[PDB]
Amino acid sequence: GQIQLWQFLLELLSDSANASCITWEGTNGEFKMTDPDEVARRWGERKSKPNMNYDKLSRALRYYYDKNIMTKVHGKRYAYKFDFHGIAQALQP
DNA sequence: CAGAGGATGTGGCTTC
DNA sequence: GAAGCCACATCCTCTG
């Protein structure tokens, strides 16, 4: 508890063990969900919510476009880009 | 199956 | 004991 979504994802990406589950992809910002279910599973877990799936998760991310927190890497599959613009905003009191 | 966004609901923190 | 917003969860009818 006491956490956002866009945070959780960072936590995982800092651990190179989870590269099986979610790995940084090249350019600053870009990453891909190699396993978009083991992700969805651990999220419900951390948020004590055992009905969780990529279906509801990606909707939660689709809100972060308007907030300029992260953006969809168009065409490429299960891939996403963190957005420093609105990241720096949520990182202020 | 993605991926998209509207609609409604929800546990969360709080102002009168 | 109630109205305020917050960031999700739940759902849903598109589309490729």
PDB file of C-alpha atoms (C1' of nucleotides) in Angstrom:
ATOM      1  CA  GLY A   1       0.000   0.000   0.000  1.00  0.00           C
ATOM      2  CA  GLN A   2       0.906   3.749   0.033  1.00  0.00           C
ATOM      3  CA  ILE A   3       2.043   3.688  -3.661  1.00  0.00           C
ATOM      4  CA  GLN A   4       1.157   4.648  -7.299  1.00  0.00           C
ATOM      5  CA  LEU A   5       1.375   2.416 -10.445  1.00  0.00           C
ATOM      6  CA  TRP A   6       4.086   4.295 -12.476  1.00  0.00           C
ATOM      7  CA  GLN A   7       6.289   3.859  -9.321  1.00  0.00           C
ATOM      8  CA  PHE A   8       5.874   0.032  -8.899  1.00  0.00           C
ATOM      9  CA  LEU A   9       7.066  -0.426 -12.543  1.00  0.00           C
ATOM     10  CA  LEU A  10      10.322   1.540 -11.839  1.00  0.00           C
ATOM     11  CA  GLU A  11      10.946  -0.595  -8.664  1.00  0.00           C
ATOM     12  CA  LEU A  12      10.808  -3.778 -10.845  1.00  0.00           C
ATOM     13  CA  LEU A  13      12.957  -2.295 -13.711  1.00  0.00           C
ATOM     14  CA  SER A  14      15.781  -1.340 -11.227  1.00  0.00           C
ATOM     15  CA  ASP A  15      16.042  -5.137 -10.449  1.00  0.00           C
ATOM     16  CA  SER A  16      17.757  -6.868 -13.470  1.00  0.00           C
ATOM     17  CA  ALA A  17      16.362 -10.196 -12.062  1.00  0.00           C
ATOM     18  CA  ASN A  18      12.899  -9.175 -13.438  1.00  0.00           C
ATOM     19  CA  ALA A  19      14.330  -8.662 -17.017  1.00  0.00           C
ATOM     20  CA  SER A  20      12.466 -12.009 -17.563  1.00  0.00           C
ATOM     21  CA  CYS A  21       9.253 -10.100 -16.539  1.00  0.00           C
ATOM     22  CA  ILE A  22       9.995  -6.464 -17.689  1.00  0.00           C
ATOM     23  CA  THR A  23      13.260  -5.078 -19.250  1.00  0.00           C
ATOM     24  CA  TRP A  24      14.522  -1.579 -20.245  1.00  0.00           C
ATOM     25  CA  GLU A  25      14.481  -1.278 -24.092  1.00  0.00           C
ATOM     26  CA  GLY A  26      17.310   0.969 -25.429  1.00  0.00           C
ATOM     27  CA  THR A  27      16.514   4.749 -25.669  1.00  0.00           C
ATOM     28  CA  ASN A  28      16.009   6.785 -22.436  1.00  0.00           C
ATOM     29  CA  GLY A  29      12.307   6.296 -21.443  1.00  0.00           C
ATOM     30  CA  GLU A  30      11.566   3.116 -23.485  1.00  0.00           C
ATOM     31  CA  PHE A  31      10.890  -0.304 -21.839  1.00  0.00           C
ATOM     32  CA  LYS A  32       8.889  -3.482 -22.794  1.00  0.00           C
ATOM     33  CA  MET A  33       6.816  -5.998 -20.713  1.00  0.00           C
ATOM     34  CA  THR A  34       8.420  -9.321 -21.878  1.00  0.00           C
ATOM     35  CA  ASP A  35       5.787 -11.041 -19.598  1.00  0.00           C
ATOM     36  CA  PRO A  36       2.619  -8.861 -19.363  1.00  0.00           C
ATOM     37  CA  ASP A  37       0.877 -11.262 -16.856  1.00  0.00           C
ATOM     38  CA  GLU A  38       3.520 -11.971 -14.129  1.00  0.00           C
ATOM     39  CA  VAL A  39       3.522  -8.101 -14.020  1.00  0.00           C
ATOM     40  CA  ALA A  40      -0.335  -7.896 -13.725  1.00  0.00           C
ATOM     41  CA  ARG A  41      -0.217 -10.726 -11.075  1.00  0.00           C
ATOM     42  CA  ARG A  42       2.346  -8.975  -8.739  1.00  0.00           C
ATOM     43  CA  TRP A  43       0.415  -5.617  -9.021  1.00  0.00           C
ATOM     44  CA  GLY A  44      -2.870  -7.092  -7.659  1.00  0.00           C
ATOM     45  CA  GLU A  45      -0.652  -8.784  -4.996  1.00  0.00           C
ATOM     46  CA  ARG A  46       1.100  -5.491  -3.906  1.00  0.00           C
ATOM     47  CA  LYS A  47      -2.385  -3.779  -4.013  1.00  0.00           C
ATOM     48  CA  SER A  48      -4.128  -6.815  -2.324  1.00  0.00           C
ATOM     49  CA  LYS A  49      -6.386  -7.180  -5.435  1.00  0.00           C
ATOM     50  CA  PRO A  50      -6.432 -10.802  -6.743  1.00  0.00           C
ATOM     51  CA  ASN A  51      -8.789 -10.055  -9.748  1.00  0.00           C
ATOM     52  CA  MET A  52      -5.972  -8.131 -11.564  1.00  0.00           C
ATOM     53  CA  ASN A  53      -4.915  -8.669 -15.249  1.00  0.00           C
ATOM     54  CA  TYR A  54      -3.194  -6.799 -18.173  1.00  0.00           C
ATOM     55  CA  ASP A  55      -6.788  -5.792 -19.217  1.00  0.00           C
ATOM     56  CA  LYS A  56      -7.470  -3.454 -16.199  1.00  0.00           C
ATOM     57  CA  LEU A  57      -3.714  -2.613 -15.791  1.00  0.00           C
ATOM     58  CA  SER A  58      -3.198  -1.135 -19.329  1.00  0.00           C
ATOM     59  CA  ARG A  59      -6.389   0.990 -18.717  1.00  0.00           C
ATOM     60  CA  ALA A  60      -4.664   2.402 -15.551  1.00  0.00           C
ATOM     61  CA  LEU A  61      -1.654   3.263 -17.837  1.00  0.00           C
ATOM     62  CA  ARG A  62      -4.001   4.764 -20.523  1.00  0.00           C
ATOM     63  CA  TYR A  63      -4.854   7.496 -17.904  1.00  0.00           C
ATOM     64  CA  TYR A  64      -1.093   8.426 -17.642  1.00  0.00           C
ATOM     65  CA  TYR A  65      -1.076   9.728 -21.301  1.00  0.00           C
ATOM     66  CA  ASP A  66      -3.264  12.768 -20.311  1.00  0.00           C
ATOM     67  CA  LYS A  67      -1.018  13.418 -17.238  1.00  0.00           C
ATOM     68  CA  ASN A  68       2.154  13.203 -19.486  1.00  0.00           C
ATOM     69  CA  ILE A  69       3.529  10.585 -16.977  1.00  0.00           C
ATOM     70  CA  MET A  70       4.169   7.883 -19.664  1.00  0.00           C
ATOM     71  CA  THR A  71       3.341   7.308 -23.397  1.00  0.00           C
ATOM     72  CA  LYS A  72       2.646   4.218 -25.634  1.00  0.00           C
ATOM     73  CA  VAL A  73       5.484   3.083 -28.008  1.00  0.00           C
ATOM     74  CA  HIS A  74       3.164   2.866 -31.110  1.00  0.00           C
ATOM     75  CA  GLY A  75       3.177  -0.381 -33.196  1.00  0.00           C
ATOM     76  CA  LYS A  76       5.714  -2.293 -30.990  1.00  0.00           C
ATOM     77  CA  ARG A  77       4.046  -4.838 -28.626  1.00  0.00           C
ATOM     78  CA  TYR A  78       3.528  -4.393 -24.793  1.00  0.00           C
ATOM     79  CA  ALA A  79       6.128  -1.512 -24.904  1.00  0.00           C
ATOM     80  CA  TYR A  80       5.895   1.871 -23.048  1.00  0.00           C
ATOM     81  CA  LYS A  81       7.924   5.114 -22.513  1.00  0.00           C
ATOM     82  CA  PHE A  82       8.140   7.052 -19.179  1.00  0.00           C
ATOM     83  CA  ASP A  83       7.589  10.851 -19.684  1.00  0.00           C
ATOM     84  CA  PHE A  84       9.910  13.113 -17.557  1.00  0.00           C
ATOM     85  CA  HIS A  85       7.524  16.128 -18.219  1.00  0.00           C
ATOM     86  CA  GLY A  86       4.651  14.910 -15.930  1.00  0.00           C
ATOM     87  CA  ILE A  87       7.013  12.571 -13.938  1.00  0.00           C
ATOM     88  CA  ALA A  88       8.790  15.718 -12.556  1.00  0.00           C
ATOM     89  CA  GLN A  89       5.247  17.060 -11.658  1.00  0.00           C
ATOM     90  CA  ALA A  90       4.078  14.007  -9.583  1.00  0.00           C
ATOM     91  CA  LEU A  91       7.607  14.330  -8.004  1.00  0.00           C
ATOM     92  CA  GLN A  92       6.721  17.695  -6.260  1.00  0.00           C
ATOM     93  CA  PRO A  93       4.773  18.404  -3.005  1.00  0.00           C
TER      94      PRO A  93
ATOM     95  C1'  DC B   1      -6.019 -11.035 -29.086  1.00  0.00           C
ATOM     96  C1'  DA B   2      -4.037  -5.898 -28.734  1.00  0.00           C
ATOM     97  C1'  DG B   3      -5.139  -0.941 -27.959  1.00  0.00           C
ATOM     98  C1'  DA B   4      -8.346   2.875 -27.146  1.00  0.00           C
ATOM     99  C1'  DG B   5     -11.317   5.844 -24.205  1.00  0.00           C
ATOM    100  C1'  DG B   6     -16.180   6.585 -21.947  1.00  0.00           C
ATOM    101  C1'  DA B   7     -18.917   5.225 -17.923  1.00  0.00           C
ATOM    102  C1'  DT B   8     -19.450   3.978 -13.338  1.00  0.00           C
ATOM    103  C1'  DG B   9     -17.774   2.525  -9.030  1.00  0.00           C
ATOM    104  C1'  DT B  10     -14.298   2.628  -5.088  1.00  0.00           C
ATOM    105  C1'  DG B  11     -11.233   2.806  -1.111  1.00  0.00           C
ATOM    106  C1'  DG B  12      -8.808   7.192   0.212  1.00  0.00           C
ATOM    107  C1'  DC B  13      -8.193  11.416   2.718  1.00  0.00           C
ATOM    108  C1'  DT B  14     -10.671  15.596   4.550  1.00  0.00           C
ATOM    109  C1'  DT B  15     -13.501  20.513   5.118  1.00  0.00           C
ATOM    110  C1'  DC B  16     -17.601  22.521   7.000  1.00  0.00           C
TER     111       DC B  16
ATOM    112  C1'  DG C   1     -21.765  12.606   9.556  1.00  0.00           C
ATOM    113  C1'  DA C   2     -21.372  14.582   4.888  1.00  0.00           C
ATOM    114  C1'  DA C   3     -19.126  16.759   0.565  1.00  0.00           C
ATOM    115  C1'  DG C   4     -14.641  17.499  -1.549  1.00  0.00           C
ATOM    116  C1'  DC C   5     -11.311  15.345  -4.897  1.00  0.00           C
ATOM    117  C1'  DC C   6      -7.529  11.110  -6.100  1.00  0.00           C
ATOM    118  C1'  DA C   7      -6.046   7.247  -8.682  1.00  0.00           C
ATOM    119  C1'  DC C   8      -6.902   3.733  -9.331  1.00  0.00           C
ATOM    120  C1'  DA C   9     -10.479  -0.830 -10.489  1.00  0.00           C
ATOM    121  C1'  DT C  10     -14.412  -2.503 -13.192  1.00  0.00           C
ATOM    122  C1'  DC C  11     -16.611  -2.660 -17.235  1.00  0.00           C
ATOM    123  C1'  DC C  12     -17.594  -2.077 -22.354  1.00  0.00           C
ATOM    124  C1'  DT C  13     -18.135  -1.331 -27.197  1.00  0.00           C
ATOM    125  C1'  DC C  14     -15.561  -0.003 -30.620  1.00  0.00           C
ATOM    126  C1'  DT C  15     -11.217  -0.929 -33.894  1.00  0.00           C
ATOM    127  C1'  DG C  16      -6.988  -3.445 -36.385  1.00  0.00           C
TER     128       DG C  16
END
